[PDB]
Ligand binder design. Structure first.
Ligand SMILES: *[C@@H]1O[C@H](CO[C@@H]2O[C@@H](C)[C@@H](O)[C@@H](O)[C@@H]2O)[C@@H](O[C@@H]2O[C@H](CO)[C@@H](O[C@H]3O[C@H](CO[C@H]4O[C@H](CO)[C@@H](O)[C@H](O)[C@@H]4O)[C@@H](O)[C@H](O[C@H]4O[C@H](CO)[C@@H](O)[C@H](O)[C@@H]4O)[C@@H]3O)[C@H](O)[C@H]2NC(C)=O)[C@H](O)[C@H]1NC(C)=O
Ligand SMILES: *[C@@H]1O[C@H](CO[C@@H]2O[C@@H](C)[C@@H](O)[C@@H](O)[C@@H]2O)[C@@H](O[C@@H]2O[C@H](CO)[C@@H](O[C@H]3O[C@H](CO)[C@@H](O)[C@H](O)[C@@H]3O)[C@H](O)[C@H]2NC(C)=O)[C@H](O)[C@H]1NC(C)=O
Ligand SMILES: *[C@@H]1O[C@H](CO)[C@@H](O)[C@H](O)[C@H]1NC(C)=O
Lengths: 403, 409
């Protein structure tokens, strides 16, 4: 039984804040590995996943990668890369060791640059993947005029910059573009003055409560307004200076949240023979005391992407692995070509790449009285929107008008 | 009795954004020969070089950084060129307890001791233009300055430093405008806001676009003074660019009288440095080694910094003198060379070499003015000793510099 070694790069330490992503996905990884070994899918071989803790640090993460190449076995590909600056360092250098990388948690749009990161792939949609989804939502509700509210932090300005390109050549006008660093109130007053009705917001959880505070003060809420903001905030994030809690909840009422869909809602069997609901029960039993991670499905589908890629690669070699060392450019190209062929239904839906980027599912939520409730989903492959009937609601007789 | 080999791990960018390695590698080869042939510097040790071509790419350099650290022999210092490559190796270096010495990095971000605890550079930070700027403002009695930059991290960082430096001198920044590629709207705003003293930071392609727009808006004349980086090609404003409407005569008009600051990279003086060479002798010696002519070969103007980097290290190692026992897992020797590097003070081919608290090189700046489509040397400024050499070569339309204010027109 020869090994097909894979370099697992992720923060695993309890000390490191992002170690929760690494540990939270490991039960899902274990489940996929166990099944692939049982079914003898990789027969004669077996998937050998070696884990190296990157600690979410540029220097430590580089040394972890360097140490894995020096002392570790001959890895065929990289699995992981969570933290944006460490992942970019590794992802940029990949070709030097002819190593294809598959991440399940790095969402930074920067990585979509295939001139800089040609050997990098990811099962998780990037932070920009929300923009083709929002376009569909605007088209659906006939919102042709929008305003934007962005925090001057790279994570958010990347998203706002991508929005320009998505709305170009569509019947949608960005009538007002407003930025803020520490306080949104000045920008929120300008949006009110320019008579903006549909606001596309890109800011962190801390800034969101300030945004909705200014919104209440400037009456930028109710039947006339639609706030479309991030959907990845902590639940009860608003509970955690001048506005009251009841006044924040009043301004928040009806906001639409946008984020990737953690797992498929379709009760259809996946590549493993389990529906997403069955896998989720299997994951929750296996995780035990370890806290759950929203990237667990992306990590699970990730292992299947690697196993299926290795299968295709093995067939390509037979059409004409042990000797591969980072020197074999040709095998790296074979693995790279095999990964680009990925097309199967996984626990996060259909797993397909478009230039290393995941074509996935985007979840739409709406804040209703006390929490965010699912109101729809966008399918990136088909470019379609499905709005759940009798969930989404507007304070007025009709959805708001854009002017 | 037995001379022991001590190794430098270097990265030379032979291609990329700054192909500085083309003239910097031979300059390094010459400096090592010069240090090794002198029995009064490291008599007990022989300084040897192990190098790779980084191609001025962090991704590419990551491969060679591995090759330098995970292959025998043990290296005692790391020497990168490009700012992007130095950011990568200087941040990573603490994991192998290594001093990093750059011969070609100008990025202001590289003067951060939290991110880069063991970093030094013989190439000064781009922020070295800022004390000369504040000094020229103080000389001509201006307290109101407008700034225009192209959208690049290095320019943003340089303007960020200029802010805290003008505040110390009782000078304020009136207006700050930026552009990614097209400077039409930021220059139109400079006219609208009636800006007189303007600092503009951009590359050559963008400079032609700025000054074409500057002609169209009549943003030049007696009323205005432009402060640019003196790093452009010889008749940059005369260079043909089909993207600009303006003519050669029209932009020779728009650029008339502007001031430039440039980092001094070769001692203008005819003195002899520690190698006992003159600035002129170094150039002649260097020209001989090269396959191609100085104009063709990249990093020729920065080559004295690479030569001086080798001497800075040799003298630092001379001050410490147990070098064979260096290990990547031990801070002891590193902390000693850091202290010796931090205390550097010697005359090199590029001038007097000293480092600030950040590990960034302190040097003279050359101040010039464009008089009749040609740059004329109007002086030099020394940030550390606060001394300005004035040529009395400056010229102005009204016989004297204008003013920032609406007041004298
Ligand atoms: C730092 O720089 C210069 C380097 O000089 C030159 O530059 C290099 C780049 C190469 O091109 C070299 O080939 C070249 O030397 C050094 O300055 C010279 O170094 C020596 C040191 O004394 C001087 O050599 C002779 O000096 C005296 C008398 O020289 C007379 O000649 C000149 C004109 O030719 C006059 O202008 C002088 O004022 C003077 O009257 C001479 O007595 C010595 O000769 C020998 O005498 C003994 C006779 O019994 C012999 O046994 C020995 O060979 C003894 O040396 C020297 O030949 C040389 O003139 C100066 N030149 C200059 C430009 O100043 C400098 O020393 C060096 N510093 C170091 C190495 O630390
Ligand atoms: C990387 O993948 C690209 C996408 O591949 C396609 O999608 C995968 C999920 C998988 O199902 C795979 O089998 C698919 O081919 C490749 O680009 C596509 O590849 C096709 C070329 O062989 C191309 O198709 C053509 O098919 C017929 C040809 O007459 C027509 O019906 C059609 O118009 C197409 O021209 C397809 O257009 C193209 N996809 C896109 C979106 O451009 C790519 O070559 C591949 N590279 C590799 C494997 O190295
Ligand atoms: C090198 O160090 C020794 C040690 O004291 C000193 O005497 C010598 O002058 C130094 N070399 C130079 C060129 O300064």
């Amino acid at each position: 039984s020869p090994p097909l070694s894979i370099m697992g790069l992720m923060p695993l330490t309890k000390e490191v804040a992002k170690g929760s992503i690494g540990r939270g996905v490991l039960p899902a990884v274990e489940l996929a590995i166990e099944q692939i070994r049982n079914e003898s899918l990789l027969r004669p071989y077996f998937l050998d996943l070696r884990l190296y803790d990157t600690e979410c640090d540029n220097a430590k993460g580089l040394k972890a990668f360097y140490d894995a190449i020096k002392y570790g076995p001959n890895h065929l590909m990289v699995f992981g890369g969570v933290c944006p600056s460490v992942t970019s360092i590794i992802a940029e250098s990949l070709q030097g060791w002819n190593l294809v990388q598959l991440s399940f948690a790095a969402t930074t749009p920067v990585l979509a640059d295939k001139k800089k990161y040609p050997y990098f792939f990811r099962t998780v949609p990037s932070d920009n993947a929300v923009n083709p989804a929002i376009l569909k939502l605007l088209k659906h509700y006939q919102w042709k005029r929008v305003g934007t509210l962005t925090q001057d932090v790279q994570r958010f300005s990347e998203v706002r910059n991508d929005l320009t390109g998505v709305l170009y050549g569509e019947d949608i006008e960005i009538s007002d573009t407003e930025s803020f660093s520490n306080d949104p109130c000045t920008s929120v007053k300008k949006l009110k003055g320019n008579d903006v009705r549909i606001i596309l917001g890109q800011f962190d959880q801390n800034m969101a409560a300030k945004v909705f505070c200014c919104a209440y003060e400037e009456n930028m809420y109710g039947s006339k307004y639609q706030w479309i903001i991030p959907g990845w905030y902590e639940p009860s994030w608003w509970e955690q200076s001048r506005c009251l809690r009841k006044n924040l909840l009043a301004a928040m009422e009806g906001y639409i949240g946008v984020d990737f869909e953690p797992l498929s809602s379709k009760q259809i069997k996946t590549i493993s023979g389990k529906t997403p609901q069955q896998y989720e029960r299997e994951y929750n039993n296996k995780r035990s005391g370890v806290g759950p991670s929203k990237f667990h499905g992306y990590a699970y589908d990730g292992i299947w992407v690697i196993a299926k890629t290795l299968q295709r690669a093995m067939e390509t070699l037979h059409a004409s692995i042990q000797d591969f060392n980072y020197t074999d450019h040709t095998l790296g190209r074979i693995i790279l070509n095999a990964m680009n062929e990925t097309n199967f239904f996984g626990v996060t839906g259909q797993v397909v790449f478009r230039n290393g980027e995941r074509m996935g599912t985007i979840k739409f939520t709406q804040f209703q009285d006390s929490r965010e409730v699912k109101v729809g989903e966008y399918n990136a492959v088909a470019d379609t929107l499905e709005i759940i009937n009798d969930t989404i609601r507007f304070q007025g007789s009709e959805p708001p008008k854009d002017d | 009795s037995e001379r022991r080999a001590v190794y430098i791990g270097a990265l030379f960018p032979m291609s990329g954004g700054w192909p500085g390695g083309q003239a910097c590698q031979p300059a390094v080869e010459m400096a090592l020969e010069d240090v090794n042939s002198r029995r009064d510097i490291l008599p007990d040790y022989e300084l040897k070089l192990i190098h790779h071509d980084s191609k001025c790419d962090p991704g590419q350099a990551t491969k060679y950084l591995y090759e330098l650290l995970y292959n025998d022999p043990i290296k005692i210092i790391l020497m990168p060129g490009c700012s992007s490559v130095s950011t990568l190796v200087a941040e990573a270096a603490r994991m192998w307890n290594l001093i990093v010495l750059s011969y070609g990095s100008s990025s202001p971000a590289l003067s951060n001791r939290q991110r880069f605890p063991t970093f030094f550079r013989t190439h000064p930070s781009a922020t070295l233009h800022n004390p000369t700027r504040v000094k020229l403002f103080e000389k001509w009695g201006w307290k109101k300055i407008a700034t225009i930059q192209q959208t690049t991290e290095v320019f943003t960082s340089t303007l960020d430093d200029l802010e805290e430096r003008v505040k110390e001198a009782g000078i304020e920044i009136t207006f700050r405008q930026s552009f990614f590629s097209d400077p039409a709207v930021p220059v139109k705003n400079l006219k609208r806001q009636d800006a007189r003293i303007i600092v503009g930071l951009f590359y050559e392609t963008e400079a032609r676009k700025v000054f074409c727009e500057v002609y169209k808006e009549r943003l030049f004349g007696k009323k205005y003074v432009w402060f640019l980086i003196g790093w452009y090609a010889d008749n940059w404003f005369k260079i043909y660019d089909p993207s600009i409407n303006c003519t050669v005569d029209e932009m020779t008009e728009a650029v008339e009288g502007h001031i430039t600051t440039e980092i001094v990279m070769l001692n203008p003086a005819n003195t002899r440095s520690i190698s006992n060479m003159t600035s002129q002798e170094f150039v002649e010696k260097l020209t001989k080694r090269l396959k191609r002519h100085p104009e063709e070969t990249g990093g020729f103007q920065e080559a004295p910094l690479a030569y001086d980097a080798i001497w800075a290290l040799a003298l630092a190692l001379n001050k410490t003198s147990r070098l064979e026992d260096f290990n990547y897992n031990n801070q002891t020797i590193t902390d000693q060379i850091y202290r010796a590097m931090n205390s550097s003070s010697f005359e090199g081919v590029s001038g007097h070499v000293v480092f600030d608290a950040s590990g960034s090189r302190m040097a003279w700046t050359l101040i010039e003015q464009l008089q009749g489509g040609s740059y004329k040397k109007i002086g030099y400024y020394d940030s550390t000793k606060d001394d300005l050499s004035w040529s009395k070569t400056d010229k102005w339309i009204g016989g004297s510099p204008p003013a920032d204010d609406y007041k004298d027109d």
